[PDB]
Design a protein around this ligand. Sequence first.
Ligand SMILES: COc1ccc(CNC(C)=O)cc1
Length: 121
Amino acid sequence: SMEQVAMELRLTELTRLLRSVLDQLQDKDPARIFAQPVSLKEVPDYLDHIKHPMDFATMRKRLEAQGYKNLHEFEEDFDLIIDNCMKYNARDTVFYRAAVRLRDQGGVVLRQARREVDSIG
Ligand SMILES: COc1ccc(CNC(C)=O)cc1
C-alpha cells in the first residue's frame, strides 16, 4: 500500500538520523573500548555477569537492517553499553571511566536527536 511505503520512508530517514547519531556517539569512544562485543574467549565469565551484552558494532548491524523502530529502542541499546560496563568494571578502571565519559558526552548528542525526531515527526 501507499501507507506502507510512507512508513518505510520515515523508517529510512530515522535510520539516516540514527546513523549520524551513532557516528557522533562512537567518536566519544576514541579508545574503541566499546567498538566490538566483549570477547567470550578472552573474558570467559562475562555472560555470568552481564545478561544483555551490547557494543557499537552490534548496534550498527541492527541499524543498517533498519532494526530500530524509534529513538527509544536505539537509546536502550546505547544505555546497555554504558550500564554493562559500569557493572562489570570497577570504579577505578579505564573501562568504567570511559563509560562515564561516553555517557556524559553522549547526552548532548541524544538531547538534540530527540528534538529532531520529534520535530521532523
Ligand atoms: C581482554 O581484556 C579486556 C576485555 C574487556 C574488558 C572490559 N570491557 C568492557 C566494555 O566492559 C576489559 C579487559
